[PDB]
Amino acid sequence: GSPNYDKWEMERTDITMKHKLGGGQYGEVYEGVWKKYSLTVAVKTLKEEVEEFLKEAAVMKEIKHPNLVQLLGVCTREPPFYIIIEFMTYGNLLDYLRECNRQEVSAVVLLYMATQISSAMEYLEKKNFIHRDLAARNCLVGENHLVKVADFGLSRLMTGDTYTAHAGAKFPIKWTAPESLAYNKFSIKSDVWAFGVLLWEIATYGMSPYPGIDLSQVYELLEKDYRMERPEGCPEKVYELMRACWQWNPSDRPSFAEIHQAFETMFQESSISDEVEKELG
């Protein structure tokens, strides 16, 4: 074989760069086209640090799942570096929920979304990886309400049961578990907490978490056992799972395996009524 062959490396000239996607919401991530195959793609690059970029690229080569956005290739031999990923046509979940028709995106669709996401996290959990940035803004939407988890910039394969982030490092307060906020300690359980917040975002069709409350007051409130209220219309079972995800002690939070099982079940039962209803009109 050829000496410098690398299965993941693509020629940067193969890609046409267009414009930043998500309205620049995700930084240097552009919509591009893999000319050879007339395929629209998402390309993350580095402005003119690298270590984190290369780490993100390496992690994406190791994970593969139906509900995890798929790495297509990279350009990391020389700058500018690229990470070429499949493009999800309906954008991110947060904006999708904020602009959707609710008769279309009904209760069964919200359950379907949660099910797909928990499926991706169960896979990651099994592989001992942590995501560290679960949020609706970081989930993507495809045709027929297909949903995939994205943005693996902070994802890590753990060696132990916990990962301690750099010192002085700071995180998205409203999606971050108590022990993460206070001691920079992360784990599969901290992702579970974030998933609970994501569920709330889904249930509210994209509302910003902790309505009214000041970020500076969030931790103190959680410490006294305050937790967001059940959204209008959220089934009790779902709110209960939500509250379990927000148990103060990480060990008390359920596993993604358990979470996925619960949602698959609710989705299927909810789905039956949906199919029937559909078949009346």
Ligand X SMILES: COc1ccccc1-c1c[nH]c2ncc(-c3cncc(C(=O)N(C)C)c3)cc12
Q: Which residues contact ligand X (rule: CB under 6 A)?
A: 21-22, 26, 29, 42, 44, 69, 85-88, 91-92, 138, 140, 150-151
Q: Is the peptide bond before 80 cis (omega within 30 degrees of 0)?
A: yes
Choose among 158, 163, 151, 164: nearest CA to 128. 158
Residues annotated within a binding site: 21-29, 44, 86-92
CB of 11 to ligand X, least distance (A): 20
In the bound state with ligand X, the residue whose beta carbon lies nearer, of 42 and 110, is 42
133 among known catalytic residues: yes
CB of 171 to ligand X, least distance (A): 16
In the bound state with ligand X, the residue whose beta carbon lies nearer, of 56 and 122, is 56
CB of 131 to ligand X, least distance (A): 12
DSSP 163: E
Question: What sign does the dihedral 188-194-196-202 (CA atoms) show?
Answer: negative
Choose among 137, 151, 260, 239: nearest CA to 196. 239
CA triple 163-240-91, angle to 5 deg: 65
Distance CA(99)–CA(130), nearest Å, equals 30
* Residue among 6, 14, 95, 133 flagged as catalytic: 133
CB of 83 to ligand X, least distance (A): 8
Is 66 within 8 Å of 147 (Cβ atoms)? no
In the bound state with ligand X, the residue whose beta carbon lies nearer, of 26 and 200, is 26
Distances (CA, A) of 174 to 56, 159, 260: 24, 27, 23
Distance CA(136)–CA(131), nearest Å, equals 13
In the bound state with ligand X, the residue whose beta carbon lies nearer, of 20 and 227, is 20
Is 192 within 8 Å of 254 (Cβ atoms)? yes
As annotated, the active-site residues are 133
